[PDB]
Amino acid sequence: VNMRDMLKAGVHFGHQTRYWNPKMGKFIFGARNKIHIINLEKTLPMFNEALTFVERLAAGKNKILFVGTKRSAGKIVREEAARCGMPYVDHRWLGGMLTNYKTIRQSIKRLRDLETQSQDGTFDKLTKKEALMRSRDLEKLERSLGGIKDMGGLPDALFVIDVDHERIAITEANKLGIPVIGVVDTNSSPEGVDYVIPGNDDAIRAVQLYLNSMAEAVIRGKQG
RNA sequence: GCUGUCGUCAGCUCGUGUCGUGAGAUGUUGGGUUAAGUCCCGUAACGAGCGCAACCCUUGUCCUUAGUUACCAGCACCUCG
Numbered sequence: 001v002n003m004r005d006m007l008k009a010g011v012h013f014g015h016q017t018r019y020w021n022p023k024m025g026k027f028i029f030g031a032r033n034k035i036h037i038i039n040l041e042k043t044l045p046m047f048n049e050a051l052t053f054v055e056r057l058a059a060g061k062n063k064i065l066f067v068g069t070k071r072s073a074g075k076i077v078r079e080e081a082a083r084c085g086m087p088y089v090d091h092r093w094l095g096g097m098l099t100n101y102k103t104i105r106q107s108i109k110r111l112r113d114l115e116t117q118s119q120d121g122t123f124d125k126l127t128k129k130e131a132l133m134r135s136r137d138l139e140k141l142e143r144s145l146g147g148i149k150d151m152g153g154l155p156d157a158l159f160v161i162d163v164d165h166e167r168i169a170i171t172e173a174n175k176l177g178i179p180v181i182g183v184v185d186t187n188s189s190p191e192g193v194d195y196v197i198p199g200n201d202d203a204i205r206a207v208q209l210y211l212n213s214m215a216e217a218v219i220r221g222k223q224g
Numbered sequence: 225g226c227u228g229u230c231g232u233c234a235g236c237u238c239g240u241g242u243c244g245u246g247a248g249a250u251g252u253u254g255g256g257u258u259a260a261g262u263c264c265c266g267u268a269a270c271g272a273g274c275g276c277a278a279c280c281c282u283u284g285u286c287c288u289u290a291g292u293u294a295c296c297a298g299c300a301c302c303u304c305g
């Protein structure tokens with residue numbers, strides 16, 4: 001908002017200049033002291049475009065999936081996708097979560113009924129020898145499948161925090177053919193992302209800026 | 225039908241997904257660890273089956289029930305078994 005919250009924290013920064021993607025050359029305002037700088041005055045209209053798109057998609061009972069698996073960004077998306085509904089992923093993305101949803105449906109069922117088992121009133125009233133194993137399986141399943149426990153159907157649109165690190169999700173999203181929102185850094189590619197956000201990554205303040213923007217956008221959208 | 229052998233070695237495969245024009249490949253590679261494809265972590269793979277392990281028999285400790293044809297600590301007799 002108003003070119004100052006983003007200009008303050010970390011948004012006007014890039015990944016040096018040695019590792020830059022030619023297709024970002026149109027978004028570079030300059031390279032001060034060997035580091036690329038993003039043209040924020042161009043980011044604002046498309047940032048607001050993404051905000052208004054997700055806001056108008058909120059009304060209509062559509063589900064928006066968030067992807068944030070990264071160092072120091074998983075917990076932010078975990079807590080921030082909390083409330084306002086919507087699923088998320090907070091740890092390693094599983095290959096085939098979209099193109100092979102039938103298989104992961106079984107894992108979802110296993111997670112649900114094992115959660116019921118371990119929280120039925122302490123069903124495991126027996127030796128801890130295999131109860132520890134059961135709890136370990138529970139936490140292992142949670143750590144990768146907690147965010148998508150709901151949403152029996154495929155998401156109508158998807159949100160990304162970084163496109164280089166999780167290219168696989170975007171690839172299979174285009175293969176399924178659904179809209180995608182992505183934060184494209186200076187060493188990334190606009191290929192496969194529909195609504196581009198030429199923002200910044202690896203800076204925390206920027207990432208909660210992005211995710212709060214999205215979350216209160218969907219809040220003001222789904223009110224009806 | 226039954227049996228030997230590699231070999232009681234730890235391997236051999238499938239569904240769905242993905243990569244390749246295809247034969248095919250990933251799963252099943254990698255860092256550790258284990259008797260073991262055993263387990264953990266990572267990881268375009270996610271799961272499953274036959275194997276490994278476990279359930280069977282026996283051996284080593286104790287407890288309950290049992291005391292004849294088995295036993296003899298105590299009591300007595302004893303021809304001293």
Ligand SMILES: [Mg+2]
């Ligand atoms: Mg093909």
Ligand SMILES: [Mg+2]
């Ligand atoms: Mg193979």
Ligand SMILES: [Mg+2]
Binds near residue numbers: 252
């Ligand atoms: Mg093999």
Ligand SMILES: [Mg+2]
Binds near residue numbers: 261
């Ligand atoms: Mg096994």
Ligand SMILES: [Mg+2]
């Ligand atoms: Mg065996």
